[PDB]
């Protein structure tokens, strides 16, 4: 028939006996935060941030990683993996049925794209010290918690069980999102981006200062430290000159 | 895999041409060069360690206005699509909650009912319809097979919110397009400079001359010529003025720094006592740490924008003993100039002494 | 690397045959601040070589893993006997390594 | 010496040709033949194991007449081991003679 | 206790990567033992997933193997890099001494 | 979607072009006037070169400046013969400054 | 009819508001920076008053100009009284001209002559002396073409 999001069966979209108590509606409410983050952050990132407001010919060579660095990247990668697992389980389950019930799969793919874009936002924020913007990320994660939390409890109020895969996926995602929220709070505490007495002050880190630092492996982000992007430039520079 | 496990070969013999060739200089100068400003604008200084002032979102907007035309269309389109999609999702959720989807599916599976008296937002039944209704509301199309009945006030709140945000988006984007269309004359600057500089002999003293011209059929108004010499000096009491810029007169019939720029010109600069070029001789002027800057200012009558054009000269490029070929020539019926003879210079009788002495030894002969 | 190892040994050797003169003329610090510079240039040459080799290994291993995926999916949804699925999987895994 | 834009980017591949057929011309084709035979045998033993394993996927009740599969696997494995032993010796002989000459 | 901590960190990463590395053989066995036996129809399947059941969806294990490999190679190469840098620093300190 | 986006962009471009005309509304053509002949007369017993300049327009111009040049093929003393030689000449005002006020014909 | 006309007018006015906002976006704040305090050195056999001016922009200021003034309560010998009178001090260049090009930080200098009011002052007793030095720096920014003027002053307590 059509290309549904709760199937071809009429009784699957009803809203009697609990508007938040019908599973498909909980699925949509989970879909909301991801698309909200994506629509706020794709134009904002696209619009560029490069206006040279001062003499910046040698100022772009410095950037200081935000307070909590490694936990954020590793946890965000874990969220990408867990969402991949949920996508996979949803696709398989839909592949075991008759119609094309989409409420098992599409929310997970949207979450995948949203988490990838979240890490994109973090990277593009970090390169330019402008802490205020990362407040947006805070809201995203916080909002996300709420929606996902409801699903767990709305499963637990029906007792879907601890043995089923979906329970495991939802629990892993809830706790990982919570840890990331903790990362955001710690960033707010250490970088003083909203409501400390005043924004803090630091001196950008000392290797990048002297232009002798080129083997920049120790000084770059962990997802780039892992696939050795720090060397990239030099190697592709092997055509011009020895 | 472990290329060099056998580490035993060490200090057996190398004993070679590494630098002990003795017929080739060991040293490698590598010839790096630093000038005060590049040959084609782009002043190359080094500001660093400046107390930064952070950032502010108004700078992001400032970037939004200054974009190349192949990106304004992209940001336009993305903004429009994202807005339509976002409000489509909001409308779809509203339709879901109020019990409209279920009503339409159940009473259209069996056509017996035909009931549309109690619905939140008529004729919204799917996400496709919601993403066509949002189109009909944002762009002021209003197809109208989908009215909004008056009942569910959440829908009315969403309509007010979306109409106002859509108007904001339309106004801002129209503003960007108009601003970029008004400042559309402002392509770039196209002032052409001769590269090589002569020191001829003329009017009883030496000179310092080059050539400059335009390309736009609009001549430049109130053009001014400034010439400066860049060198490090110290006070007699001894303080390091790191890169002292000294202003030097450019000669003219009444000693004023305007120039009228239609056919290309010689820009003389008579070397006299105050000028820092008093003390430079022929074989000397290949070795020196000097940089002579030229600054041209004016306005273009068409676009009405003030323009400043910069160039830089070093002692290494300047070639004593020359002058510039007369590019002009009275043609069959009207003057003409061939810019192809721009960098062409010829040699003529050139004294080899210093103007420092070209009055000390008072013979025009050298 | 081969260019930054010849001097680093030579310096050491020199400061081994001339100990009485070197320790007399009391130029010790001028020589230590040179031994440090030589050894640091050599160490950075070696480190960059090791980083380049590891870079090559990471990139080529990821290419191999992509081969593994595109082989497993091709063999899964295809018309072939199970012998050429098991052989294919095993050989496509070893190709990666 | 302008090698980087042009000389460096292409491998020597001409001194290499002299090295390949260096000790002569009959010490190379032996290496090529032995290499190819050894590699083909090393693939074939696994191929045969796969064929034998696959042919009885359905025959649950009777695991009989397994003497042919075992004989095939053993003979192919022995031949492969022999070719493996041969090939390295051939290559090393070629290298030694080439160095001498 | 002086220049040895990073070697322990490298050994930790190496052990974790080594544990995850064995996913090649196990996934190969699973995929093979799924592709052979015929399962065309009539087995009750209303409930969406049984923990045990997910592991043998044949196509699924292929994706799990792909991700596991692409993670194992990166982790192992990271281990190599950390221990290499530790070794280079150790050589520099020993030569200076 | 395609047609809507194209239509709105076209509307923006057309609005911009009409905005440019409505901004250049105040612009007109050349409006200052010089005589059809110079003259050469005697002023305070000195032989001086003079001409006439006027404005035929609505406003009074700001910060005017009158510059005079001679384009001639002189003879360079040492072979740097530049054919179209532009030599600036000094206008007269007892402050030795060129600026001039334009109200009536001058 | 009435409602449609009012809506059209309202839309046009707000469109004008947005155009003016976009036009006035680019300018942010004054950007020419003058020193905490000045100096009074000896340069070329006569005392000279010096101060430091720097730039923070990315572009450079076209046709920059610098003017220096001396504020002092004054009288005229024949008896008139001047209350907060201004004056002007000749900023020096080897050419007697005031245009200055600012890409590197500069030290503007002024040489003391018999005719500047900054000539009869003592050395020890400057700190207790009624004077003020005003610096005015004007120019035209190249990127957006808006004429700007930035001002600062130095007093006795901070010399
Ligand atoms: N016909 C021309 N068109 C554009 N630019 C010119 C022309 N002639 C000279 N120039 C300018 O002169 C500068 C010096 O360039 P270059 O030394 O390569 O040539 P040249 O000797 O001056 O003139 P030509 O190339 O005609 O011999 C360049 O920046 C160039 O832009
Ligand atoms: N390196 C710099 N980066 C940014 N702004 C500067 C810098 N140097 C000076 N300024 C600005 O110029 C003004 C004058 O600074 P100056 O050095 O003369 O005063 P200061 O005594 O150093 O001030 P502070 O005590 O605040 O450092 C200051 O208000 C400052 O904003």
Swiss-Prot record, chain C:
Gene transcribed to yield this protein: Abcc9
Tissue: Expressed at high levels in heart, skeletal muscle and ovary. Moderate levels are found in brain, tongue and pancreatic islets. Low levels are found in lung, testis and adrenal gland. Expressed at very low levels in stomach, colon, thyroid and pituitary.
Taxonomic classification: Eukaryota, Metazoa, Chordata, Craniata, Vertebrata
Family: Belongs to the ABC transporter superfamily. ABCC family. Conjugate transporter (TC 3.A.1.208) subfamily.
Organism from which the protein derives: Rattus norvegicus (Rat)
Extracellular side: 1-82
Domain of life: Eukaryota
Protein localization: Membrane
Full-sequence portion shown in this chain: 1160 to 1256 of 1545
Subunit structure as annotated in this protein's UniProt entry: Interacts with KCNJ11. Interacts with KCNJ8.
Transmembrane segments: 83-97
Official protein name in the record: ATP-binding cassette sub-family C member 9
Protein role: Subunit of ATP-sensitive potassium channels (KATP). Can form cardiac and smooth muscle-type KATP channels with KCNJ11. KCNJ11 forms the channel pore while ABCC9 is required for activation and regulation. Can form a sulfonylurea-sensitive but ATP-insensitive potassium channel with KCNJ8.
From Swiss-Prot, chain F:
Tissue spec: Widely expressed, including in pancreatic islets, pituitary, skeletal muscle and heart.
Tree of life domain: Eukaryota
Site (Role in the control of polyamine-mediated channel gating and in the blocking by intracellular magnesium): 11
Cystine connections: none
Transmembrane segments: 1-17
Subcellular location: Membrane
Function of the protein: Inward rectifier potassium channels are characterized by a greater tendency to allow potassium to flow into the cell rather than out of it. Their voltage dependence is regulated by the concentration of extracellular potassium; as external potassium is raised, the voltage range of the channel opening shifts to more positive voltages. The inward rectification is mainly due to the blockage of outward current by internal magnesium. This channel is activated by internal ATP and can be blocked by external barium. Can form a sulfonyllurea-sensitive but ATP-insensitive potassium channel with ABCC9.
Quaternary state and interactors: Interacts with ABCC9.
Family: Belongs to the inward rectifier-type potassium channel (TC 1.A.2.1) family. KCNJ8 subfamily.
Protein known as: ATP-sensitive inward rectifier potassium channel 8
Gene that this polypeptide is encoded by: Kcnj8
Span covered, complete protein: 160 to 265 of 424
């Amino acid at each position: 028939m059509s290309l549904s999001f709760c199937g071809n069966n009429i009784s699957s979209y009803n809203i009697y006996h609990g508007v938040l108590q019908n599973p498909c509606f909980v699925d949509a409410l989970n879909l909301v935060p991801h698309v909200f983050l994506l629509f706020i952050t794709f134009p904002i990132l696209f619009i560029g941030w490069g206006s040279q407001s001062s003499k910046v010919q040698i100022h772009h060579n410095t950037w200081l990683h935000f307070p909590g660095h490694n936990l954020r990247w590793i946890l965000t990668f874990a969220l990408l993996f867990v969402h991949v697992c949920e996508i996979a389980e949803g696709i398989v389950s839909d592949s075991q049925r008759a119609s094309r019930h989409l409420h098992l799969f599409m929310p997970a793919v949207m979450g995948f794209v949203a988490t990838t874009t979240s890490i994109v936002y973090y990277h593009n924020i970090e390169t330019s010290n402008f802490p205020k913007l990362l407040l947006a990320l805070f809201l995203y994660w916080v909002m996300a918690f709420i929606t996902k939390t409801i699903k767990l409890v709305k499963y637990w109020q029906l007792g879907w069980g601890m043995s089923d895969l979906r329970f495991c996926i939802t629990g892993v995602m809830v706790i990982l999102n919570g840890l990331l929220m903790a990362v955001e709070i710690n960033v707010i505490r250490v970088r003083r981006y909203v409501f400390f007495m005043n924004p803090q002050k630091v001196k950008p880190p000392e290797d990048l200062q002297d232009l002798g630092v080129r083997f920049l492996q120790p000084f770059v982000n962990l997802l780039s430290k892992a696939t050795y992007w720090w060397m990239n430039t030099l190697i592709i520079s092997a055509h011009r000159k020895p | 895999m472990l290329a060099r496990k056998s580490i035993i070969p060490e200090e057996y013999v190398l004993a070679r041409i590494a630098a002990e060739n003795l017929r080739k200089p060991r040293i490698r100068d590598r010839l790096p060069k630093a000038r005060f400003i590049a040959k084609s604008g782009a002043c190359n200084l080094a500001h660093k360690n400046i107390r930064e002032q952070g950032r502010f979102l108004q700078d992001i907007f400032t970037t939004l206005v200054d974009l190349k035309w192949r990106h304004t269309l992209v940001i336009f389109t993305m903004s429009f699509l994202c807005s339509w999609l976002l409000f489509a999702i909001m409308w779809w959720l509203v339709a879901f909650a109020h019990g409209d989807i279920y009503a339409y599916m159940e009473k259209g599976i069996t056509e017996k009912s035909g009931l549309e008296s109690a619905v939140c937002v008529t004729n919204v039944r799917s996400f496709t319809s919601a993403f066509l209704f949002s189109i009909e509301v944002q762009v002021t199309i209003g197809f109208g097979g989908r009215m909004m009945t008056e009942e569910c006030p959440l829908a009315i709140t969403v309509l007010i919110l979306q109409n106002i945000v859509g108007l904001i988006i339309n106004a801002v984007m129209l503003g960007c397009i108009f601003m970029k269309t008004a400042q559309a004359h402002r392509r770039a600057e196209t002032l052409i400079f001769s590269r090589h500089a002569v020191i001829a002999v003329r009017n009883g003293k030496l000179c310092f001359m080059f050539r400059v011209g335009d390309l736009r059929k609009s001549m430049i108004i109130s053009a001014s010529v400034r010439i400066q010499v860049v060198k490090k000096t110290t006070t007699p009491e001894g303080e390091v003025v790191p890169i002292h810029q000294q202003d030097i007169p450019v000669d003219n019939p009444i000693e004023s720094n305007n120039i009228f720029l239609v056919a290309p010109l010689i820009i003389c600069h008579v070397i006299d006592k105050r000028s820092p070029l008093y003390d430079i001789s022929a074989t000397d002027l290949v070795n020196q740490d000097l940089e002579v800057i030229v600054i041209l200012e004016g306005v273009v009558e068409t676009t009405g924008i003030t323009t400043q054009a910069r160039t830089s000269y070093i002692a290494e490029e300047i070639q004593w003993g020359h002058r510039f070929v007369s590019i002009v020539t009275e043609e069959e019926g009207v003057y003409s100039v061939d810019y192809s003879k721009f960098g062409n210079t010829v040699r003529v009788a050139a004294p080899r002494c210093s103007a420092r002495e070209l009055d000390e030894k008072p013979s025009i002969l050298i | 690397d081969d260019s930054t190892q010849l001097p680093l040994l030579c310096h050491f050797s020199e400061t081994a045959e001339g100990l009485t003169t070197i320790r007399a003329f009391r130029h010790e610090t001028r020589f230590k601040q040179r031994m440090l510079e030589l050894t640091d240039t050599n160490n950075i040459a070696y480190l960059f070589l090791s980083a380049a080799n590891r870079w090559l290994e990471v990139r080529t291993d990821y290419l191999g893993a992509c081969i593994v995926l595109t082989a497993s999916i091709a063999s899964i949804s295809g018309s072939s006997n199970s012998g050429l699925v098991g052989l294919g999987l095993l050989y496509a895994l070893t190709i990666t390594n | 010496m302008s090698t980087v834009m042009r000389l460096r980017t292409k491998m020597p591949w001409k001194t290499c040709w002299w090295y390949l057929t260096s000790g002569g011309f009959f010490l190379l084709f032996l290496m090529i033949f032995s290499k190819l035979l050894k590699h083909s045998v090393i693939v074939a033993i696994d191929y045969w194991l796969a064929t034998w394993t696959s042919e009885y996927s359905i025959n649950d009740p009777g695991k009989a007449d397994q003497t042919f599969y075992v004989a095939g696997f053993s003979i192919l494995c022995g031949a492969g081991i022999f070719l493996c032993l041969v090939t390295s010796l051939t290559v090393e002989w070629m290298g030694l003679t080439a160095a001498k000459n | 206790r002086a220049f040895g901590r990073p070697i322990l960190l490298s050994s930790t990463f190496r052990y974790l990567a080594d544990l995850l590395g064995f996913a090649g053989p196990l996934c190969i066995s699973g995929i093979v033992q799924r592709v052979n036996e015929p399962k065309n129809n009539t087995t009750r399947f209303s409930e969406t997933l049984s923990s045990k059941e997910f592991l043998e969806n044949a196509h699924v294990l292929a994706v799990l193997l792909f991700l596991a490999l692409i993670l194992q190679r990166t982790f192992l190469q990271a281990s190599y890099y950390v221990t290499i840098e530790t070794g280079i620093n150790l050589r520099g300190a020993l030569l200076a001494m």
